[PDB]
Ligand binder design. Structure first.
Ligand SMILES: C#CCCCn1c(Sc2c(C)cc(C)cc2C)nc2c(N)ncnc21
Ligand SMILES: [Mg+2]
Ligand SMILES: [Mg+2]
Ligand SMILES: [Mg+2]
Length: 226
């Protein structure tokens, strides 16, 4: 419209990355803690996907009949867990979709991600880029435990430079869905406190149609946060 070849995937990737780049900076200038918001939204979207799938595939929720989001803090082990029972991710998705983005130099493999899928690098960046990279505002590493209906449970790790994926030695523990694990920095220890997580979760979960729980306490159990 004002530049050459704006319809190109090269331009679409740059425009999407610029958009994400501006969303994270703007959040840092106003201090908005978008990552947990993005995690709850991204978990809700995965539940929407598997529920849309269940509308046509009768045996889609067989691995896990509940549609929840469960957030858990491990102040001892310094970990943040966001677990959804959504569509889940196959190993192919973790490697060729998320892995291609997480691995450095993603802009080299734009045409490799173009050869009809309906999921291009720029589209994946616009959909999941803000949530993925805002996690590195508070975390040093992102570990993804995911079990899709058409694959076995895998575990996937990245520091936004390299990535690695193995099969879960524990087997099929999720049934279906994804657990996002953030290895938070020491300067992000505030988000291991129950009160700040419960408050932030209830804020971002007020308008979510899916039940969202937080591991709360002399006995611990899942607490409804609406
Ligand atoms: C790229 C790509 C395709 C992957 C799509 N995708 C993501 S991306 C993401 C990850 C892996 C970790 C963080 C901290 C944030 C984001 C946004 N999360 C889920 C999910 N829970 N369920 C189903 N699909 C998901
Ligand atoms: Mg233009
Ligand atoms: Mg897409
Ligand atoms: Mg590295």
């Amino acid at each position: 419209s004002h530049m050459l070849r704006e319809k190109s995937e090269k331009f679409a990737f740059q425009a999407e990355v610029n958009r994400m780049m501006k969303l994270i900076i703007n959040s840092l200038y106003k201090n908005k803690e978008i990552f947990l918001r993005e995690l709850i939204s991204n978990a809700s979207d995965a539940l929407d996907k598997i529920r849309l799938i269940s509308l046509t595939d009768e045996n889609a929720l067989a691995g896990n009949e509940e549609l929840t989001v469960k957030i858990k803090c491990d102040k001892e082990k310094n970990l943040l867990h966001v677990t959804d029972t959504g569509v889940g991710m196959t190993r192919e998705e973790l490697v060729k979709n998320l892995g291609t983005i997480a691995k450095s130099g993603t802009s080299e493999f734009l045409n490799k991600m173009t050869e009809e899928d309906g999921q291009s690098t720029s589209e994946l960046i616009g959909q999941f880029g803000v949530g993925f990279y805002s996690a590195f505002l508070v975390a040093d590493k992102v570990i993804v435990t995911s079990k899709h209906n058409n694959d076995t449970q895998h575990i996937w790790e990245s520091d936004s430079n390299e990535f690695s994926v193995i099969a879960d030695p524990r087997g099929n523990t999720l049934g279906r869905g994804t657990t996002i694990t953030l290895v938070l920095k020491e300067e992000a220890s505030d988000y291991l406190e129950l009160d700040t997580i419960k408050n932030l979760v209830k804020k971002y979960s007020q308008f979510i149609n899916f039940p969202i729980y937080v591991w709360s306490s002399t006995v611990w159990d899942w607490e409804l946060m609406n």
